[PDB]
Symmetry: D2
Subunit: 256 residues, 4 copies
């Protein structure tokens, strides 16, 4: 089946940053035809640690910049919502509505995304056991969602640390397509780039339906997640590597 | 003075709220040195199941809480789930409660601070104690003056919460600290037998108040049935914590 | 019932250090008559992180120094063993044989301590659930132990950190007397003295049969656990405080 | 070359050891680029229950392992539990295994290094990856030259272990790394369904070898019955990890 690669700059810093990354993603979608690419960027970072950190340029501006990417590159789009009222306006450009990890249990937000008719990708909360994502999918189906994904992005392990329990991949696969978030899983809440690639190799060896990766032309200059965003020039190499590992491991993927 | 936040988990009906309100009123008259605050949720926004009880709406909820405040002269507190709810709730709530999962949502925090009311934030199960400093700053930026941080357990493996009591003195550096005796023992996705022992530890360590959900018949509760404390047991537990606090307070470390 | 206070310098740095601390403990046992004091110090630190750290002066020397304390002060003694063969020689002076946290599951070491006829205090492993200490007590009883204690000393919480889950006190009380280790519970594996006293207050409010505390004339000069050993001059204050908190909380201790 | 450590959890009888030995021998002839090491414990030193199976003794154990090495020409490895056992075990064991709970016992480590044999240390469930640096130094001080560190899960709440694969590249800085596919999925105080998937992750990430307990009829095993892999499945799993490793090795980060 077609492997999903969700990629893009963490935050919509400007419409220009988006087209730059979008252009590279467009080029890669032309080379890796067996992959379905989806462009990602948040119009708002609603839970920065500090009140003084970069949040974004607002929903209107964000949706508009995202639409320019879809327009100019024919790329599918995904962005995250933070309150119920945002679902409708965001569904106009987003092919996949993303539900933030901390909000993965908010019934209204889930129901709001589901009735738009768009696909829904839920980031698994850092506090959530894999088996408890079952009711999250149930709520979405109840609300009308026909295409659902669950994203593994790490679990709380002591203070300011996250661990990836790969047993979660086959468990969540029982009720939804599973995505591995290579970026947020190595971040230290309140991260280490050196572990992005090895953990991503683990994900595809185990088996998943896609990977999620934040990438930026110059990570050290990003306004959010500068430590874990992948340099844009490395994207191609990472993708080719996971497709190769996926191919050789695939005959061994267990059936749910 | 020492804070005691209590009431039924969910606003199952204003009838229930008045019955519980009556007892809290009685205790408030008996324990004059304690500030009692009546709590109850107009909406359970993240029940595990889509088929579970959520409530009767914000409007019906704000009305029931208004009845309790009017009928008994008790202060009020309830939790909000999206920014637009702050203002209408502020009409009745003396203290606006920020849910544990939403303790990092900047807009929700700012909306609560803007109402001018007091704000009590439930520490996320994913949050380190020292990281609540930033939460408090968001509220200050937003204009809040009376800020509380509530300890309610930390993710410990799957389906389990542990209470790291080191958090009490750590958070006290920037806000008044409340200990949630109800939710700290519940198993996510709890054992009532541990509620009282951990409450004792909380006052022995030192905190500015205690939060406890109580119900006339916990067994019949539409939410947190396993952990809500039977109304009849509330008095003895309050007397016990005041006595322990009276003796232990002599050793509370300076802020 | 009589409350137990196990105290002493972490390691037997010299026979002189022992008599100095022992003298203070003797004085306190005369004031706090409702308390049963037990003198503690290890003749060997068998698991220091570094091969270059202080281990001790050997078993013979250690037992000899401990015996001098019992002799000179009429104090009960406790020290920990690390291999089965040490049980017999150590039982000659030790009233309570301590089993190290990492070895709490070693059947032979438990059996070796049990057949000496002495009391046995097992430190609960950092990896052990409270309910699983039941079989630890079963093994000891099987081996002949009539007086058993289980010591709470923290649980692994992420990396280099320990948390105290006070629910363990009433759980372990179902099958043994429970001791709270005020020292090792705040240490950071591979600690914070500022949390020793507050957590100890929590322990007695919850309810336990005793407390364990490492103390030294000058902590900053100790050869082991210099960060968490309690200054000897503070011992009296801590003890008086926990006895007061214990008294006021006692009527509320639940029955097992 | 790639290391594959395998055999029955406990030495239930030398008969069992020879039956498993025969298959490992066969696989060793089939996978020439793989160094196979036969493992089995002469004593289960920390069974939860006093009434469980421990074994038939060190002497009977060392003898059975000697038979396997003689009869099949396979290298040997078994674990020690107290210092005095190192020397007698070293007679037969090419690699001395240090138990997870005992990875910090200095005397046990030194006794193992002194025998001149290779030493494989199971990383304690309580140990951080970076803290194995000191373990390796103790062994070097003691004169060991061939040192291995085995990843076998980390305490995650109660009765659960999680595998933090970041540990593989971290430990590789000071020793050869082995991944224990059997114990990493067992629930302390496990699910076989996760053994193969995690093994795949281990080779995709990069390690110097894999450790796997296998038994002719896991169901009838006197130890780790829930997690020992049926002998018949061993071949397919080895072929699978060699294939994955062949492709993935191109991306292994430099030490």
């Amino acid at each position: 089946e077609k492997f999903l690669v969700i990629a893009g700059p963490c935050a919509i810093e400007s419409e220009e940053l988006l087209l730059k990354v979008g252009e590279e993603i467009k080029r890669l979608s032309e080379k890796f035809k067996e992959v379905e690419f989806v462009f990602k960027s948040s119009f708002d970072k609603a839970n920065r640690s500090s009140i003084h950190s970069f949040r974004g340029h607002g929903l209107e501006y964000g949706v508009k910049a995202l639409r320019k990417v879809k327009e100019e590159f024919g790329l599918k789009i995904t962005t995250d919502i933070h309150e119920s009222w945002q679902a409708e306006p965001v569904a106009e450009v987003a092919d996949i509505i993303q539900i933030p990890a901390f909000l993965c249990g908010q019934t209204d937000l889930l129901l709001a995304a589901a009735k738009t008719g768009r696909a829904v990708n839920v980031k698994k909360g850092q506090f959530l056991a894999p088996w408890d994502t079952k009711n999250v999918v149930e709520k979405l189906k109840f609300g009308g969602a026909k295409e659902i994904y669950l994203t593994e992005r790490g679990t709380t392990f002591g203070y300011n640390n996250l661990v990836v329990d790969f047993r979660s991949l086959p468990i969540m696969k029982q009720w939804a397509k599973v995505i591995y978030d290579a970026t947020h899983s190595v971040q230290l809440p309140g991260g280490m780039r050196e572990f992005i690639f090895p953990l991503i190799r683990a994900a595809v060896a185990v088996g998943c339906d896609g990977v999620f990766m934040e990438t930026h032309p110059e990570p050290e200059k990003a306004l959010s997640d500068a430590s874990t965003q992948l340099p844009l020039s490395q994207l191609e190499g990472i993708i080719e590597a996971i497709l190769e590992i996926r191919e050789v491991a695939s005959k061994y993927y267990e059936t749910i």
